[PDB]
């Protein structure tokens, strides 16, 4: 979904897309698409794959959908690690197991006590626990 990209990222992508291309239609050549992607801040193989995925004309929603998959993963991983490690103040990232289970059962969402016990039995660093729960 396109809702993963923030408003600032969408605005910057639109600004670069409009600045690279001249006045007229938003269609941009595949080589020009790669040049604009390089000007916006990837490998040659990734650029070729993105050009083949999207004649030779690329419009704005196509560029947004292509960049969302590349910008979502690392940002989500970093945000998850930072948010999981934000509770404890020790700085090491490995909080108490009982405290982590109590925080997961009391705050977060709506889950039964049996489900929390099963998740604790299936499960300690915060980022490691988040990555294990995501998988």
Numbering used by the authors: 1 to 41, 44 to 56, 61 to 129, 137 to 148
The study reports:
Ryanodine receptors (RyR) are >2-MDa membrane proteins that allow for the release of Ca2+ from the ER and SR, thus mediating a range of Ca2+-dependent processes. Each forms homotetrameric assemblies of ~5000 residue long subunits. Mutations in RyR1, the skeletal muscle isoform, can cause malignant hyperthermia (MH), central core disease (CCD), and other myopathies. Here, a collection of cryoEM structures provides insights into the molecular consequences of MHrelated RyR mutation R615C, and how apoCaM opens RyR1.
